[PDB]
Paper text:
MarR TFs typically function as environmentally responsive repressors of genes encoding efflux pumps that export xenobiotics, including many antimicrobial agents, and are defined by the presence of a winged helix-turn-helix (wHTH) DNA-binding domain. SlyA has been best characterized in Salmonella enterica serovar Typhimurium, where it serves primarily to upregulate virulence genes. Although this contrasts with the classical repressive role of MarR TFs, work in our and other laboratories has demonstrated that SlyA positively regulates genes by a countersilencing mechanism, in which repression of AT-rich promoters by the histone-like nucleoid-associated protein H-NS is relieved by SlyA.
Studies by other groups have previously determined the structure of apo-SlyA and the SlyA bound to DNA, demonstrating that SlyA is similar in overall structure to other MarR proteins, consisting of six alpha helices. Helices α1, α5, and α6 make up the dimerization domain, while α3 and α4, along with the wing region between α4 and α5, comprise the wHTH DNA-binding domain. Dolan et al. previously observed that the two recognition helices of the apo-SlyA dimer are only ∼15 Å apart, in a closed conformation. During interaction with a high-affinity binding site, the helices move a significant distance to accommodate the 32-Å distance between major grooves. Our structural data indicate that SlyA binds a total of six salicylate molecules per dimer, at least four of which are likely to be biologically relevant. The analysis of these mutants indicates that both site I and site II bind salicylate in vivo and that both sites influence SlyA activity. Although the general structure and architecture of the salicylate-SlyA complex are similar to complexes formed by other MarR TFs, including MarR and MTH313 from Methanobacterium thermoautotrophicum, the various TFs differ significantly in their specific interactions with salicylate. MTH313 binds salicylate asymmetrically at sites similar to sites I and II of SlyA, binding only one salicylate molecule per monomer.
Residue numbers in the entry:
A (entry chain A), B (entry chain A): 2 to 80, 89 to 141
Amino acid sequence: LESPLGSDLARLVRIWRALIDHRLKPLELTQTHWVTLHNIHQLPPDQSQIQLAKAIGIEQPSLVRTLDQLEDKGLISRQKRIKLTEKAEPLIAEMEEVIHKTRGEILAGISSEEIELLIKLIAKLEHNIMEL
Amino acid sequence: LESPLGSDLARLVRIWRALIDHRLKPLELTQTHWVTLHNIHQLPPDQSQIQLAKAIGIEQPSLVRTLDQLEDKGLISRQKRIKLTEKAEPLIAEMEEVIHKTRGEILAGISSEEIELLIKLIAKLEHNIMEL
Ligand SMILES: O=C(O)c1ccccc1O
Ligand SMILES: O=C(O)c1ccccc1O
Ligand SMILES: O=C(O)c1ccccc1O
Ligand SMILES: O=C(O)c1ccccc1O
Ligand SMILES: O=C(O)c1ccccc1O
Ligand SMILES: O=C(O)c1ccccc1O
């Protein structure tokens, strides 16, 4: 088709992130940090590095500086598997609450069956991509 | 809702970009560079800095290093308005061809009326976001 789908989506995702970044600044989480912690939070327990980078859609080595920092601030433990600490729990719970609440306002006036099709479509687009 | 829409989209967009990045590496365009040139290309002629950052969904100062480089390699001219040069034309045309062609393969088996709803939905999501 003619329509610039990938850059429409890429803009949307940038402005949605930027809204969240603003709302989370008091927590002085940077983008990369909350993105990565959120991702850890929505995965099941004990992810390998490799599962995490994949769920994010990035390549490990970029993941590693971000993880190293989080480990430095004691947010995260590794023994290569990944566990949120006791110490990150209040920070996470408040982060997730702002993210959840922002999603409810973003999703306002969009029907569940419309959101359900978006999700199934995202899936197919990604499958095409991975198949290449 | 419960569903992690923003990170689904953010993954999709990361893996779609990464596919394009791979395909464009022979041209040794970096991500930021092709993203920005593509954006310039799909806009009407002579954008201000400000229109460009907005179409991308970023804030000007990040835009500026990238533009400075492009101007250094003679891809781009400014007099604060922005014009692709004569010299960038073959590079652009080949870039756009790879992007266009990648979109056709990504969009395979998805109906036009389904792609048309995605586009209208992206629009509404962004409007909610800007309204905040
Ligand atoms: O601008 C982007 O980030 C982008 C991402 C995927 C496809 C096309 C694009 O312009
Ligand atoms: O792009 C990155 O470097 C990155 C690193 C960690 C988490 C999310 C990210 O996009
Ligand atoms: O909607 C707001 O005003 C807001 C501000 C910060 C965090 C979550 C929010 O909903
Ligand atoms: O992971 C992201 O980049 C992201 C972007 C917007 C909303 C939620 C997210 O996790
Ligand atoms: O995030 C950036 O710094 C950036 C800069 C120029 C173009 C696209 C971008 O995402
Ligand atoms: O599909 C491919 O093999 C390909 C490779 C590079 C550029 C555009 C493409 O379609």
